[PDB]
Design a protein around this ligand. Sequence first.
Ligand SMILES: [K+]
Ligand SMILES: [K+]
Ligand SMILES: [K+]
Ligand SMILES: [Mg+2]
Ligand SMILES: [Mg+2]
Ligand SMILES: [Mg+2]
Ligand SMILES: [Mg+2]
Ligand SMILES: [Mg+2]
Ligand SMILES: [Mg+2]
Ligand SMILES: [Mg+2]
Ligand SMILES: [Mg+2]
Ligand SMILES: [Mg+2]
Ligand SMILES: [Mg+2]
Ligand SMILES: [Mg+2]
Ligand SMILES: [Mg+2]
Ligand SMILES: [Mg+2]
Ligand SMILES: [Mg+2]
Ligand SMILES: [Mg+2]
Ligand SMILES: [Mg+2]
Ligand SMILES: [Mg+2]
Ligand SMILES: [Mg+2]
Ligand SMILES: [Mg+2]
Ligand SMILES: [Mg+2]
Ligand SMILES: [Mg+2]
Ligand SMILES: [Mg+2]
Ligand SMILES: [Mg+2]
Ligand SMILES: [Mg+2]
Ligand SMILES: [Mg+2]
Ligand SMILES: [Mg+2]
Ligand SMILES: [Mg+2]
Ligand SMILES: [Mg+2]
Ligand SMILES: [Mg+2]
Ligand SMILES: [Mg+2]
Ligand SMILES: [Mg+2]
Ligand SMILES: [Mg+2]
Ligand SMILES: [Mg+2]
Ligand SMILES: [Mg+2]
Ligand SMILES: [Mg+2]
Ligand SMILES: [Mg+2]
Ligand SMILES: [Mg+2]
Ligand SMILES: [Mg+2]
Ligand SMILES: [Mg+2]
Ligand SMILES: [Mg+2]
Ligand SMILES: [Mg+2]
Ligand SMILES: [Mg+2]
Ligand SMILES: [Mg+2]
Lengths: 82, 86, 151, 205, 80
Amino acid sequence: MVTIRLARHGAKKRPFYQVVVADSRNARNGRFIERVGFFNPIASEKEEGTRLDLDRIAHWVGQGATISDRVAALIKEVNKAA
Amino acid sequence: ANIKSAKKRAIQSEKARKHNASRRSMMRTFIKKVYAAIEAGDKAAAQKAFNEMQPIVDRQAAKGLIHKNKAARHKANLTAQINKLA
Amino acid sequence: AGDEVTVVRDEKKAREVALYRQGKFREVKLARQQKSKLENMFANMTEGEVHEVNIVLKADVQGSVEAISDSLLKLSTDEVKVKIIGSGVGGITETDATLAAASNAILVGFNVRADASARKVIEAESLDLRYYSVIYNLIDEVKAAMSGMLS
Amino acid sequence: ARYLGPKLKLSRREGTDLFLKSGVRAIDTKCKIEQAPGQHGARKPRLSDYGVQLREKQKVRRIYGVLERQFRNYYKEAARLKGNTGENLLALLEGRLDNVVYRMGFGATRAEARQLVSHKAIMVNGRVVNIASYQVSPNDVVSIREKAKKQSRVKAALELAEQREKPTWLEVDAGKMEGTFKRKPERSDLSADINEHLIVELYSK
Amino acid sequence: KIRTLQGRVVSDKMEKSIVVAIERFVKHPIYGKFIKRTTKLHVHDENNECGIGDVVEIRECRPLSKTKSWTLVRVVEKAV
RNA sequence: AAAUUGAAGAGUUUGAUCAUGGCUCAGAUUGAACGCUGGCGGCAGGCCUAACACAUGCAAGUCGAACGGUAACAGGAAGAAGCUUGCUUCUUUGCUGACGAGUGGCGGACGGGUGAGUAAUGUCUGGGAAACUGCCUGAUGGAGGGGGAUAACUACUGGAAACGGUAGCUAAUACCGCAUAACGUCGCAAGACCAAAGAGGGGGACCUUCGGGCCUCUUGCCAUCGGAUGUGCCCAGAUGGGAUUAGCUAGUAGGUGGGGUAACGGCUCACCUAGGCGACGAUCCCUAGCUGGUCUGAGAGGAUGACCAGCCACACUGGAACUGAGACACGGUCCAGACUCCUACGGGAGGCAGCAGUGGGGAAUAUUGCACAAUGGGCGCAAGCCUGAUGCAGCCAUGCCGCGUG
RNA sequence: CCCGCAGAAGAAGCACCGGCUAACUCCGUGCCAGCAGCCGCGGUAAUACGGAGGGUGCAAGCGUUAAUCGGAAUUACUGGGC
Ligand SMILES: [K+]
Ligand SMILES: [K+]
Ligand SMILES: [K+]
Ligand SMILES: [Mg+2]
Ligand SMILES: [Mg+2]
Ligand SMILES: [Mg+2]
Ligand SMILES: [Mg+2]
Ligand SMILES: [Mg+2]
Ligand SMILES: [Mg+2]
Ligand SMILES: [Mg+2]
Ligand SMILES: [Mg+2]
Ligand SMILES: [Mg+2]
Ligand SMILES: [Mg+2]
Ligand SMILES: [Mg+2]
Ligand SMILES: [Mg+2]
Ligand SMILES: [Mg+2]
Ligand SMILES: [Mg+2]
Ligand SMILES: [Mg+2]
Ligand SMILES: [Mg+2]
Ligand SMILES: [Mg+2]
Ligand SMILES: [Mg+2]
Ligand SMILES: [Mg+2]
Ligand SMILES: [Mg+2]
Ligand SMILES: [Mg+2]
Ligand SMILES: [Mg+2]
Ligand SMILES: [Mg+2]
Ligand SMILES: [Mg+2]
Ligand SMILES: [Mg+2]
Ligand SMILES: [Mg+2]
Ligand SMILES: [Mg+2]
Ligand SMILES: [Mg+2]
Ligand SMILES: [Mg+2]
Ligand SMILES: [Mg+2]
Ligand SMILES: [Mg+2]
Ligand SMILES: [Mg+2]
Ligand SMILES: [Mg+2]
Ligand SMILES: [Mg+2]
Ligand SMILES: [Mg+2]
Ligand SMILES: [Mg+2]
Ligand SMILES: [Mg+2]
Ligand SMILES: [Mg+2]
Ligand SMILES: [Mg+2]
Ligand SMILES: [Mg+2]
Ligand SMILES: [Mg+2]
Ligand SMILES: [Mg+2]
Ligand SMILES: [Mg+2]
């Protein structure tokens, strides 16, 4: 199936997760259909902590995709913020 | 092999194999009989063979042993031949 | 063989200690060899009747190498000399194969075997591999080998 | 690494003062500047074009206390930027923290300023920065810690910097022992003794 | 709407099949001199209506036969 | 606004000169090696050679909410027995929690490794029609009633072992009928035909043998049309050297009819035609995994494919097929070969180019480490289990980069 | 990542110096021993061999070798000739 999962980027002790729509059968950093946004658990308070394109999330879920736990909590938090 | 699952899988695959062998054997027996009737030229016998064969392919395709398209092709070609006869 | 074994505290210093020990040993051994060679080259200008036999030796354990080499070197005579080119512990490998093939020598395996890499060079080369498992028979055959050269 | 050796020998080779001393005594009272170092320093040989370009480059590099690779990186960055490369690289070199803090008058020599910096004695914008090669931005504020505010060498520095010429793009308050770097200079505010063309043609081979 | 290519007959010997040359005219990569290249294709035709020397129109189709993946559409001009 | 601003020569043939012409040097860069020397830190990188051979440890499991069940540990129950009368051995009970082995379900076709082979069976780009697809999702409905086996187990019984053979032996979402059948299949129509499986949670009243019935909820199963995803098939162009390699081809090129495949097709056979490709380079020989890119260069260009990412192929060598939604399958099966090992010589076992590691080759390249805390993956309702992927650590001036030795 | 302690205290080598090409003098040998990328040094006046003093360039690195491009318009389409 297609799902939205977190892909790790950046450097040691410096994580940067892309939010990715991809087949579950590929690797963590493997092929994917579309990049949707990003999250950074290290960034300082003067910089944006996260960004997601909610419309595409809705579109793909309607198509039939599934959401992981961390991504789901992320959408929950952003919806709380806005 | 080395892993438990490999051994168990081989053991059950053997069973699946002999069962499939038997069912496919019945399948070919029936198509052979209907083909022989078709070459014979007796329309009544051909129709009778077609009607005894017809449920069998559908049942075996239902269980997945042969995909639906193969059964459909067989039935359509055989009825085309029987109409060639008459 | 026989060297003292000690546990050491730290990691980095051991490598330097071992390499420093190796450098001086290499220096000294080369020093003796080239001292002898430089001193005696022109003394070797004269010649005489000498029967030399060259052997290359592979043995299973360190002490076995020592013993076999010691026996062969003590067996040397003023006119009959058994000059071992070089010996080491382990299997008969391509270094030994091409070494014995290069010089007029023989590969002797004492409780050790050959390997495919040396095997190919040997079959192409027609080098002689002599196999023995008892010290006595080895001494007997090598004694025959050197004694056959005379006259 | 740095150049830790004798200092006046650099000036003698280059043939002109490099301000590598405090200034309590005139440079001539310390060394025979006109003669080059070495036993054959009396002679004046011919210097070819490549020689003079190399001497100019070496003069700049020694005056700002920069090693070779760092200077190469500076030149590359200046080439990448817009405008006349000489102007840009001159701005780049003057953008170092050591040159600025010396130029603000908090030290006797660039070496002394660097030794102060490396020992966490300064803040920019209230943030302690010990890295010498840090590059400063306009409107940044530089100050000394109160902990090292008591240093007598800093005190005497505040005085001996007075007899020097003071810059135009900088503002300094001895009352609060701090400074503001209003804006970056162009080529004009610096010495005409620096010929940038030779450096440009040298590296651009 | 259908993509269609136009070409020259060169072989009507094959049964219910013809051979057509498509001439294309393109520049050279580095030299820039304009060359004239040709592609030969096998086309299916069902009444053998074509003749050598004609110029016809053909289009893509399923693999009706091995090495026969294009179909005749309309005969543009006749030989002779 | 922005996203480019780019171009140096010198030495050397002669008594001396101009020219032509070869040679040598100054610059960048590397998966580098060796010599001398050696403080710290941050990020990266580390068998290019024998696709040579491998000791040892680990690298693929999970579900008692599918099932017959107690192999172990625990709790309860009779009170066995004891017994200090309210404390402790064995006396048991699938009774409960759980769970060794077994059937059954899903997963080992992904993740990882390597570049031996291939001049196209590949790849890159742009188009296309005759196709299927588990887990995910939309809709419409369906879910009645039976039958005979088997593992486990029990009692025997061969072999050195691997591994067996016989008899009794029980259940299920295992297996197989029958009913029912349209929007599905075939058919011009008329007509003809096709499916299945339950489990768990809680409960008032009523039945009630308390076996549970009965109500409700969740989750499973069957059919058909859709979506999303993956994969299969075809076309045009592009993709090394050698013309001291000029002709190649008979299922070969077409056509008719059968057969086969999920699908079109000489994919396969019978017959008929005598064709097809080639100087716009066929056939043949040598070499080679490709690409997004990397280095160099003012540019056009030249060389190259280490690391990251997409595609292809391979798993001791050669050949074949089953199971399966999907393989002609690294840690699956069968046959042949070589090689290594065990033996009662009667016969057997093996496959690191997975992570460490050893031998060997070489100028040359590391630890037989910690943890599933995070990302991601398989199984489950979930708790949870597994993961040498991955996170982190150890060695190495291999490189870029910052600092000090006042 | 921060604070305290003591002490200049625990820490600099490599290559080159005749022209190309930045930087010279003496001693030791005497076409020998040797150097070398090229022209070429050495037969008792060696800035070119060895040692020393001085100097030049890099720097926790410095050199030699291997290899690709540039210099090469020396395959010349941009850009060569008979
Ligand atoms: K087996
Ligand atoms: K049933
Ligand atoms: K020091
Ligand atoms: Mg992959
Ligand atoms: Mg099944
Ligand atoms: Mg550095
Ligand atoms: Mg065009
Ligand atoms: Mg620190
Ligand atoms: Mg149970
Ligand atoms: Mg019990
Ligand atoms: Mg269990
Ligand atoms: Mg497998
Ligand atoms: Mg390899
Ligand atoms: Mg396409
Ligand atoms: Mg039975
Ligand atoms: Mg029963
Ligand atoms: Mg079933
Ligand atoms: Mg009807
Ligand atoms: Mg039925
Ligand atoms: Mg290529
Ligand atoms: Mg034929
Ligand atoms: Mg046909
Ligand atoms: Mg290859
Ligand atoms: Mg550039
Ligand atoms: Mg290019
Ligand atoms: Mg590769
Ligand atoms: Mg192998
Ligand atoms: Mg095979
Ligand atoms: Mg199958
Ligand atoms: Mg395969
Ligand atoms: Mg394996
Ligand atoms: Mg075997
Ligand atoms: Mg390995
Ligand atoms: Mg070696
Ligand atoms: Mg997880
Ligand atoms: Mg495990
Ligand atoms: Mg380091
Ligand atoms: Mg000079
Ligand atoms: Mg020298
Ligand atoms: Mg001359
Ligand atoms: Mg002299
Ligand atoms: Mg000298
Ligand atoms: Mg000196
Ligand atoms: Mg050029
Ligand atoms: Mg060129
Ligand atoms: Mg010319």
